[PDB]
Structures are given as C-alpha cells and as structure tokens.
Write a protein that binds this ligand. Structure first.
Ligand SMILES: N=C(N)NCCC[C@H](NC(=O)c1cccc(O)c1O)C(=O)N[C@@H](CO)C(=O)O
Ligand SMILES: N=C(N)NCCC[C@H](NC(=O)c1cccc(O)c1O)C(=O)N[C@@H](CO)C(=O)O
Ligand SMILES: N=C(N)NCCC[C@H](NC(=O)c1cccc(O)c1O)C(=O)N[C@@H](CO)C(=O)O
Ligand SMILES: N=C(N)NCCC[C@H](NC(=O)c1cccc(O)c1O)C(=O)N[C@@H](CO)C(=O)O
Ligand SMILES: N=C(N)NCCC[C@H](NC(=O)c1cccc(O)c1O)C(=O)N[C@@H](CO)C(=O)O
Ligand SMILES: N=C(N)NCCC[C@H](NC(=O)c1cccc(O)c1O)C(=O)N[C@@H](CO)C(=O)O
Ligand SMILES: N=C(N)NCCC[C@H](NC(=O)c1cccc(O)c1O)C(=O)N[C@@H](CO)C(=O)O
Ligand SMILES: N=C(N)NCCC[C@H](NC(=O)c1cccc(O)c1O)C(=O)N[C@@H](CO)C(=O)O
Ligand SMILES: [Fe+3]
Ligand SMILES: [Fe+3]
Lengths: 347, 346, 346, 346
C-alpha cells in the first residue's frame, strides 16, 4: 500500500517490517508508542543521539532490556558522522528519518543510497512543525509499521489531552496573553541564547496560549536571540530547557528519568543566577520554569504543552496534572515505569 | 435626615466641628473626607488607632504633631471607654461601628449620647463590607458635610473594584480556588482566627475565591481549628497582620513603616509554624500576607485587588494595587504612601 | 541657587509641590524625575501635551485617570494662556521653555510670576538640544529635589549618545551623507518645515549627518521651498510626524498607539507627494520617519540613535534604539513602552 | 462643574429625578444610563421620539405602557414647544442638542430655564458626532449620576470603533471609495439631502470612505442636486430612512419592526428612481440602506461599522454590527433587539 510522509513523498508500505532503521535515535519515542512490551524487537540500528543525548531514558530501558546495548549505532550525534556503509549492511526494510535534527534530511546522499537499494524511507517530524506534523507523523508510522491500532489509540489520547488546553487558550485574545521566552539548552550553549521561533517549542507556547517573544525575531524553527534583546523585551515568563544528567558537572538544567525534584530545582536556580538572566522580571517574580529539552522532538510533547498552559494561566489549569497524563501515557503505551522530573518550578 | 447602617434615622447637624470616633480606626473613613486638614474636627477617639495602628499613627504625627493631643476616650475595648470623659468633650456627632473595638448600637453610651442631644451615626466596614462600605461613606459624607469628597471616593472605589468584579462575577464556582484567611495569624492565643460570611470573607467572595470558612462559621468573625484547615487543605493560604517591624511579639509585619524584606521574613516565620508548613498552598508558594486593618477600612479595595491577583495571577497581571494605593493617597490624603501592605512568599 | 537656560539665577525652593508647566510637553523632562508618581506635583500645564500628544496622554490616563483633572492654563499657543488662571493655582515653581508653544523669557506672565514671588526656570530641548538638554535636566533635578533621578538620567543619556559619537565624531565631512528633515511633513500649509543649526539639526550633526538646511536658515526652525530640496537632492530624506492612527488629516502617524504597518503606510503617503517622490533618497529607499515630539524632549537620544543607524547602517547594526527606549522606560517611567517612534520605508 | 457641548459650564445637580428632553430622540443617550428603569426620571420630552420613531416607541410601550403618559412639550420642531408647559413640569435638568428638532443654545426657552434656576446641558450626536458623541456621554454620566454606565458605554464604543479604525486609518486617500449618502432618500420634496463635514459624514470618514459632499457643503447637513451626484458618479450609494413597514409614503423602511424583505423591497423602490438608477454604484450593486435616526444617536457605532463593511467588504467580513447591537442591548438596555437597521440591495 502507499502513504504520504512528512516530506510530501509517497512511501510504499512494506508487507511486514522487522528491520527498522532510525535516522535519529530519539525517533525511538514515536516507535515506543507502537511496540508495546516489545520496544526494541524490530530495531536493526539507530543514530547514537538516543544513547548519548538521552542517557537517563536509555539507562532505564537497559535495566529492563540489556539487549539495547547491542543495537548498532550508525553514527554519533550528527548526520555527517553516519557511515552509509554500516547502514546498508544492516539490510533495513524501512528507514525512519526526521525533516530536521541530528540525523539525515530529505536531500542527504544516504536517503538516495537507500532508494537505490530498494529500501522505503519515511520522513516524520516532531521538531520543525510539531503542531502540523506530530499527529500525521504517528498516523503514518502506524501504517508503515503495522501498528494502526496503537497509533490511533495514541492520537485519541493526545488530541483529548491537548483539547483540555486548547478549549480554553484558543479563545484568549492576544492582548491578555503572557509574553514568553524559551531558552533551549540554557546555560549549556557556547553563545546565548538558543530558542524557538515559529516552530519547535514555539508551537507549544502558541497552543498553550502564550506569546513567544522570538516568534517574529526568527525565520526558522530554531535560532538565536542575544541576551540583551531578551533583557530589553523583559518577558512575563522565562522557561529554560535542559536534559542534563544529575551527576554531570557541565552547565545546564538537570531534567529526565533519573532526576529528583531537588536536583531539578537546584540546577534551574544556577541557570537563573547567571548574569543578565537574573535581572529578568520573570526571574525576580518567580515566573521561571524548566522543561525537559527532548520534548523538542517527541510525540510525548503533549506533556510540555500542558506544563506550559499551567505556567501561563496557573488558576485556569489548577485542576490539570501533566504527571497523571505521563502516567496514563506510560501505563497505556510503554514498557517502563515513569520516574524522575520532566518539569520544575523555581522555589 | 439620613438612615445609618443600624437602620436608625439621624438628624444631620447644620455644622460639625467636634467629631467623636467610637473606634479610632474609623479615622480611615474620615481621612478620605477631610483632605489636608485630617484632625481638625476630631474632638476625641477610641485608642485603637493610636495603639493598634502605631505605624500609620507615627506617619501622621511627623506631619501633624497635634495628633498626640487628641483625647483617648478608652483603650482597645468598648468596656474601657469612660462615658464621662466622652460627654465632657461636648461632641456634636459620634461615629460608631456596628461591630469592633468600640460601642455598638445597644450600648449604654449610645443611650447617654441620645439623652445629651448628640447625633449618633453607625457605619460598617467590618461585619458586611460588601453591603456597607459604600453606603457608609455616602452617609458620612452627608452628616460631615463632605458629600463631594465622599462621592469622589465612591466613584474611585467602584471603578477600582469593578476592574475585579467584571471578571470574577462571571467565573463559575468549580473554577474558583479554595481560600483560607488566617486573621492576625501567629498572634492569637488559640489558632486560627478567620472570617466567615463577612469581613475579609466578603473580599474573597468579590475576588472570585471560595472561602473555606464561609460555612464553618455563623458570623463574620470566628475560629477554625488548625486540623480543620489541614484537612480541607485549601488552594490558597492568606495571613493577615499589622505588626510593627521592631515588635518581638508573634505575627506578620505589615504597614506604613514595613519594608518588603521585613514583610517577607516575618510572613515566612508565620508559614514555618507546625502544621501550616505542610499545607499544599504553602509548599506550592500560594501563600500571602495582607495588612490586618483592611478588615475595617474603606481602603479595603486594595485587599480585594491583592486577592484577585493572587486568585488569578494572569487574568489580573496588568492590575497594580500599588498604583491604586498611590492614586488613593494623592487624591484624598495628606500623607505620602510608604511601607508594605501586602507580600508574597519567597 | 542655580543658573537656568536663559542665563537667569533661580532660587531653589525648599519644598516643591505645585509645578506649573509653561509647555505641556515639558512633562517629558519631569517624568524622568517623578518615578511612579508622575502627576503628583503638577498644578497645571499648557494644553499642548493633552492636545498635541494625544497618544502618550491616553496611555498615562488609562493608568492615572486623575490626569484629566490637571488644569489647562491654555491651548497650544503662548497667547492663549490666561495669566489669571495661572496665578490662582498658586504655583511654587514654573517651568518654561526658551522656545515653543508656551511663554518665553520676555513674556508678561514671566514678569507677573516674578512679582508674585514664584521662581521661574527656563529649560531647553528645542532650540539648542546639544547645548541645553543635559544642563536642563541637571537644573530640573536641583529645583525639583530629584538630583538622584536627574544624575541617573544624565549618565544613561551620555552613555547612549557616546555609543554614537565615539564613531561619528571622527568621521570627516566629505564622508558624511547629506540629509533633509521635513518636520510635520505633509501637515503644514506651506512645504517644507525643517531645522537649521538647532532642533533636530543638532541630532543630524551628532549622528554624523550633513544637514542641508544648516546654512539655509538663521534659526533652529524655518522653511525651505520644495524646489530647493529637489535641487540639493540630498542623500537621505527624513519626515517627522506624530499623527494619531485614526486621524485622516495629512501627516505621518507615529507614537505610543501606532503600529509599524500604520507608520509605514502613512510614511508612504508622505513620500508619494508630488516633487518629494522624485527625490533620489526617496527612489533609493533612504527615506525615514521620526516621531515629531523628539523635537522637544530629553528622550531625544532615541532619535540621535535612529539617525546614526540610518546614516551609517553597518557601523551601528549592533545598536538598537528600542532597547534604549525600554531601558529608559523601565529605569525611569511609570508606563510600559508601546507603539512606533521610528519607521523605515518599505 | 462640567463643560457641555456648547462650551457652557453646567452645575451638576445633587440629585436628578425630573429630566427634560429638548429632543425626544436624545432618549437614546439616556437609555444607555438608566438600565432597566428607562423612563423613571423623564418629566417630559419633545414629540420627535414618539412621532418620528414610532417603531422603537411601540417596543418600549409594550413593556412600559407608562411611556404614553410622559408629557409631550411639542411636536417635531423647536417652534412648536410651549415654554409654559415646559416650566410647569418643574424640571431639575434639561438636555438639549446643539442642533435638531429641539431648541438650540440661543433659544428663548434656554434663557427662560436659566432664569428659573434649571441647569441646561447641551449634547451633540448630530452636528459633530466624531468630536462630540463620547464627550456627550461622559457629560451625561456626570450630570445624571450614572458615571459607571457612561464609562462602560464609552469603553464599548471605543473598542467597537477601534475594530474599524485599526484597518481604515492606514488606508491612503487614493484607495478610498467615493460615497454619497442621501438622507431620508425619496421622502423629501427636493432631492437630495445629505451630510457634509459632519453628521453621517463623520461616519463615512471614520469607515475610510470619501464623502463626495464633504467640500460641496458648509454645514453638517445640506442639499446637493441630483445632477451633481450623477456627474460625480460615486463608487458607493447609501440611502437613509426610518419608515414604518405599514406606511406607503415614499422612503426606506428600516427600524425595530422591519423585516429584511421589507427593507430590501423598499430600498429597491428608492434605487429605481429616475437618475438614481443610472448611478454606477446602483448598477454595480454597491447600494445600501441605513436607519436614519443614527444621524443623532450614540448607537451610531453601528452605522460606522455597517459603512466600513460596505466600503471594504472582505477586510470586514469577520465584523458583524448585529452582534455589536446585541452586545449593546444586552449590556445596557431594557428591551430586546428586533427588526432591520441596515440592508443591502438584492
Ligand atoms: N553537533 C552539530 N554540529 N550539529 C547538530 C545538528 C542538529 C542541529 N541542532 C540545533 O541546531 C539545536 C539548536 C538548539 C537546541 C538543540 O537541541 C539543537 O539540537 C539542527 O537543528 N540543524 C538543523 C539546521 O541545521 C537541521 O538539520 O535542519
Ligand atoms: N548546530 C550547532 N553547531 N550547534 C547547535 C547544537 C549542537 C549541540 N547540541 C547538543 O549537544 C545537544 C545535547 C542534548 C540534546 C540535543 O538535541 C543537543 O543538540 C550544542 O548545543 N553545542 C553547543 C556547544 O556546546 C553550541 O553549538 O553552542
Ligand atoms: N481585646 C478584646 N478582648 N476584644 C476586642 C474587641 C472586638 C472583638 N474582636 C474580635 O473578635 C477580632 C477577631 C479577629 C480579628 C480582630 O482584629 C478582632 O478584633 C469582636 O469582634 N467582638 C464582637 C463580638 O462582641 C463584636 O464587637 O460584635
Ligand atoms: N475577642 C477576643 N477576646 N480576642 C480577639 C481580639 C482581641 C485582641 N486583638 C488585638 O490584639 C488586635 C491587634 C491589632 C488589630 C486588631 O483588630 C486587633 O484586634 C486579640 O487578638 N487577643 C488575642 C490574644 O492576644 C486573643 O484574644 O486571641
Ligand atoms: N499655532 C501657532 N500659531 N504657533 C505655534 C507656536 C510655536 C511655534 N512653532 C513653530 O514655528 C514650529 C515649526 C515647525 C514645527 C513645529 O512643531 C513648530 O511648533 C514656534 O516655534 N515659534 C517660535 C517663534 O515664533 C518661538 O516661540 O521660539
Ligand atoms: N509657527 C506657526 N505659525 N506655524 C507652525 C506651527 C504651528 C502648528 N503646529 C501644529 O499643529 C503641531 C502639531 C503637532 C506638534 C507640534 O509641535 C505642532 O506645532 C502648525 O504647524 N499649523 C499648520 C497648519 O496645518 C501651519 O502652520 O501651516
Ligand atoms: N420639521 C421641520 N420643519 N424642521 C425640523 C428642524 C430641524 C432641521 N432638520 C433638517 O434639516 C434635517 C435634514 C435632513 C434630515 C433630517 O432628519 C433632518 O432633521 C435642522 O436641522 N435645521 C437647522 C437650522 O435651523 C438646525 O437645526 O441646525
Ligand atoms: N428643514 C426642513 N424644512 N426640512 C427637512 C426636515 C423636516 C422634515 N423632517 C421629517 O419628516 C423627519 C422624519 C423622520 C426623522 C427626521 O429627522 C425628520 O426630519 C422633512 O423632511 N420635510 C420634507 C418634506 O417631505 C422636506 O423638507 O423636504
Ligand atoms: Fe480587631
Ligand atoms: Fe510644534
């Protein structure tokens, strides 16, 4: 059969799939929602970003599935480090790639090599245009991986849990919305400050009824705004993203499966104590928050949209709990138990 | 002739120059009428303003040292008022409160004054602020011949309250936060004082909150036990106080001579008390301090706004009670606004 | 005692609480000193701020409705000021401008005030901004007892101007672009109003531009005919305006309530006028709009910067006048920055 | 205490209970202030509302039959008002219009009332709606002690007008459509009544139209000959009327008791008249009907919106003046909106 991927390309659905290639490792998150209690059964190989840039979620899956260590790494954390030779010798029967990210895009040579080898390629997207692409991506993955039921179940769950936010924020007029700046991998980049424009976590700010101060500063989904521009705009709400492991002395916010509330609050505070940042009205007024970075490329991003709405309008979403949503997500779909801290408030 | 807050008819004097204040802090209503000559027409007052509002007192003393020479007709309780000292001041009007630290409608002193031919006016900012605050000012305007100042203050008040009520009057009950207000928190012998259907409860109602003690109490004021608070575990905790900074007694420091630091530090002591410190609202940082004397003052629009910002922070992001306060002072009063009348927990 | 901008010695009042503004838009200098209480000390003002700055007025009214009750001593001309209404406000200081829509150093009203024992201070942001802006603020600081605010603003101003002059002071004349500024472009009976050696001309000088009218005119303001502009055919065209968005009269829309799109649309109308539209600067996109009231405001550092960025685009690509405005507002003012104070042609 | 629309100072009465309406249709401004008790304070009125607004009258009569007992001080002209009947109603305030079917600022009756000690207030929705509508409501608020209702209505009005001006203020003159408005079209002896720089002309201006009579006429109202209209051949034709459905006199049927099909049929008659029917605007279907009494009513924001949607159909496709009217009625009035106040040609 045939379907349209997120690059507009038609893909012939394989009769049976047993050798999935992951162009970006963290595309595993979309796969995990379909594979039930057998998450790694059909993965022939993956980019090393999941294992190296998601060490916490990795370790949790390793403790329950030690065979994860033996899935081949086709590269490190950049598209340019992928050996096309190692890829082809795994004889994949499907390759899942992202329109953007740490893996090959629609115009890469590897995509063309795979087309010459007779291997179907599917483009998904949770990163450039999450709002447009997240649900269509899951529907498509459902069809090509023969997990239509799991996919449709997850779409219903997602739509319902997002509708809990949008029923309220879709009617709020622009002049009542809080200004928001999201600093991606805050503290951890060479040059401050990474953020999202019209795309990526910007889509989440939009949905949650916020006003992204970088929406109109930037052409793309990702970009950079200077510290002074942030200070000058002086937004209502400051959000920092990170995924740093607890026992990592490098700069950044600690969030993820092995992070405690106190490690998340302490490390957010370091981030908020930085020169310039610490004079923001949002920081002084305590409207300062942390969000787990990898939500920037995951269909679990409904958790971030909900955390954002609850920060943007605390009393209108007093009754909404993203922790229940994660637990409903894990119990319904996944094969591990939820642990750690995926979001934090400054004390 | 006018009808006071006790339903009684009062013949308005032709000229008033000797006002008796049954409760000292009724001065607050008078101050909105007297412009730059606040104490010119006060023959005497209950000692509650001087002794239970030491900060606001000291500020007025520095600009008007003659305030120290206004006679104190008693201390802080109705029973300590000498009716003899009262009558020798030959008042031409007496202003009393339906409730509080001064005589009520059925006291002997009220009857003595009626026998002496002295008009008595009952106001209320304390039992039923919502029903009574504006009618009280209207009445004080008429009997003190300051109708203009009164009407000016009513317009100011209604406008600044309507900023809140036009939003919160349409909010359904199930979207409202539960609220407990602990009056003079930390400072009473037995915890915990609060307000029912009345007093600061009216402010919670107006600001679109849900007062957990509304149905626990028959009156405007009363007491709920600590364990009942813990068990109800309300969304939002509010502590009232008016303690002076350099007062080692227990309570929250708020008022004209209090810095935000002192207010924040002393609120924290209050929030660190056994039991209180495990409240969800305290842990989640939805914990606040409000200046106690707003429990009996037509300046109470400042508290209604502070509550609304606490109950729905974003919907009232743009509302600033410091600006309401500054406008109030500049338009009506004879002193400069200083100190901290509200605080948020660190 | 201090020396004002007219060279006159002025005795500093011990306390000031009743400031008279000879020109309403002199408020801008006062606003930098009064913090969160902008209108607290203004007894009255010329009607130019309320009538010729409707946008900035409306923004302050929404936060301080008491601004509507400040008395207007006249309309928009010195000759419409009733000296009687002025004197009954019993000012304790009067602030006047060497030039503009209010009384000057030789007016009768200035003499009346001297007879009444009222100190008069002359400032200037309009005739000789470069010489006078900072000295004016220093002086206002001393006579209004806001030396701290004044010195803070001077440091901010000098630093933000030095960002421009460090570069443009070393540029030789032959590398400078020729510039014509058309004040209230489109909106005068006879084209074309502009500035000579003074007013916005000072800004062109500082920003390293070459004002084509510098030597055509004797004074700070004057008129140059359309044909003279066409013939000089300058490298850069700048139009000033302050027209409200919803005003169908001719002129450029700029100010607190103007969007970038309205500013551009209305600048374009101005650039589409016969004669103007054949200028090389217009055809080549070197066409800009600046908010007119910068012609008399110590916020004029915002214009010196917008000019420097138009005169030398890459040399000041890192300079942002919007950040400077926001630092100005947050540090000194009581309102939030909105609208469009400068625009580039599409 | 307040300045009316004639520039005259009027002393705000302490309590008003006997309002005299110089022009009956000034009721529309009063109705926005009186909530559910519209006629409670009206001692008498000009007969224009009852006789020239039969539809809106009948609707109020069905809910309030006591409206029939309000005294008529005259018919539909200032000259038919008995000053004697007026004075025996012992009004405590009289509201008059700068222009219209009632007395003006120089009438004898105004002087009689001044001799009788009765405050007179001039409002205006007719000569200079743009300048005067909102100031008129502000003033009526103060003198009738309905400041809250007035301020509420001003905010509503400004917001609903801003929906139009946000768009039309940035449209350049050369892109605007030419417009002719024929007042009480078909119903006058001599064609064609219209508005100049004033009256419905102000609405055309605001809605981003170009009134072809703006410079043909000195006043707010006047007459332009059919041939002049034909020759100018404007982009858009608008006819006003308020004729009752069951009235076979010439004119457009619009108002509270008119269906869309009766408004369309009667507009068509108006558009089928010799000369009119050769207009480009008529042939192209840019032909419309507007309810005449908007020519003197603070509900005129409904016509400004209806005009903008006719001037720029797609730019205002999302704007609905019917939703605006309904928000107006529900927020402010005591009756239910019915009928057709505007119509498009089939
Ligand atoms: N290690 C490298 N040299 N490049 C990494 C490639 C992915 C790159 N990532 C980001 O730009 C980024 C920014 C903020 C926060 C993040 O977590 C990021 O991963 C990227 O997105 N590249 C884009 C544009 O080149 C793409 O592939 O389309
Ligand atoms: N494309 C680039 N040159 N820089 C942007 C991203 C590269 C790199 N990203 C990460 O290390 C990373 C970690 C966790 C999750 C992610 O998605 C990541 O991308 C990065 O941020 N590099 C810094 C240097 O430390 C920088 O380039 O400023
Ligand atoms: N020092 C005293 N013994 N009594 C004070 C007199 C008034 C008494 N006050 C309170 O109950 C009270 C409660 C909470 C917070 C406060 O500031 C209070 O003053 C009181 O209210 N009495 C009632 C009952 O008699 C009344 O006056 O009607
Ligand atoms: N009804 C009572 N017996 N006590 C409650 C009120 C009396 C007393 N009040 C104050 O000290 C006070 C201080 C500032 C402002 C006020 O309105 C006040 O009422 C009080 O609280 N007594 C405590 C023991 O100190 C108590 O009786 O529990
Ligand atoms: N409406 C009037 N008749 N006069 C206005 C008085 C101020 C007069 N202004 C200007 O000439 C002017 C020119 C260009 C742009 C502007 O904004 C202007 O205000 C003025 O400056 N007069 C001079 C000399 O008369 C002065 O007083 O110094
Ligand atoms: N000195 C004069 N006689 N005329 C020039 C200025 C007077 C008047 N000014 C303004 O309208 C004005 C508006 C906004 C800001 C200002 O500073 C202003 O001065 C003016 O220019 N009138 C025009 C008539 O359109 C004219 O002089 O031709
Ligand atoms: N019924 C009359 N004979 N006269 C009415 C007096 C008001 C007169 N009105 C109009 O001319 C008019 C024109 C077009 C449409 C209308 O609804 C009108 O009411 C009028 O305005 N007269 C002038 C001069 O006296 C004025 O009132 O200012
Ligand atoms: N000034 C005049 N003489 N005539 C113009 C207005 C007088 C009269 N008005 C009305 O009939 C009328 C009806 C509803 C609402 C209004 O405001 C009105 O004025 C009128 O129009 N007379 C006609 C004769 O048909 C005329 O003078 O042409
Ligand atoms: Fe008390
Ligand atoms: Fe000027």
């Amino acid at each position: 059969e045939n379907i349209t991927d997120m690059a507009g390309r038609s893909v012939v659905i394989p009769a049976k799939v047993e050798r999935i290639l992951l162009g970006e490792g963290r595309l595993f998150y979309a796969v995990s929602l379909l594979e039930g209690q057998k998450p790694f059964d059909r993965i022939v190989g993956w980019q090393g970003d999941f294992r190296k840039l998601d060490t916490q979620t990795y370790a949790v899956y390793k403790a329950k599935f030690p065979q994860v260590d033996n899935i081949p790494l086709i590269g490190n954390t950049t598209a340019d480090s992928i050996s096309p030779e190692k890829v082809l010798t795994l004889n994949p029967d499907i390759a899942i790639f992202g329109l953007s990210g740490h893996g090959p895009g629609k115009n890469s040579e590897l995509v063309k090599q795979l087309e010459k080898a007779g291997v179907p390629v599917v483009f998904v997207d949770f990163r450039t245009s999450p709002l447009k692409n997240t649900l269509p991506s899951m529907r498509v993955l459902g069809k090509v991986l023969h997990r239509e039921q799991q996919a449709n179940d997850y779409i219903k769950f997602y739509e319902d849990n997002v509708r809990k936010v949008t029923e309220i924020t879709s009617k709020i007029p622009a002049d009542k919305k809080p200004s928001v700046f999201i600093e991606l991998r805050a503290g951890a980049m060479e040059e401050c400050c990474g953020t999202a424009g019209k795309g990526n976590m910007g889509d989440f700010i939009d949905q949650a009824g916020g006003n992204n101060m970088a929406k109109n500063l930037l052409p793309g989904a990702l970009g950079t705004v200077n510290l002074e521009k942030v200070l000058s705009t002086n937004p209502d709400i400051y959000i920092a993203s990170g995924g740093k492991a607890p026992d990592n002395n490098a700069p950044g916010v600690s969030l993820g499966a092995q992070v405690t509330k106190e490690q998340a609050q302490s490390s957010l505070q370091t981030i908020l104590d930085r020169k310039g940042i610490n004079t923001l009205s949002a920081v002084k007024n305590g409207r300062s928050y942390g969000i787990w970075h990898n939500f920037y490329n995951s269909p679990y991003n409904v958790l971030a949209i909900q955390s954002f709405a609850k920060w943007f309008y605390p009393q209108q979403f007093a009754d909404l709990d993203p922790n229940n949503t994660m637990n409903s997500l894990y119990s319904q779909f996944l094969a591990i138990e939820p642990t750690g801290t995926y979001w934090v408030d400054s004390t």
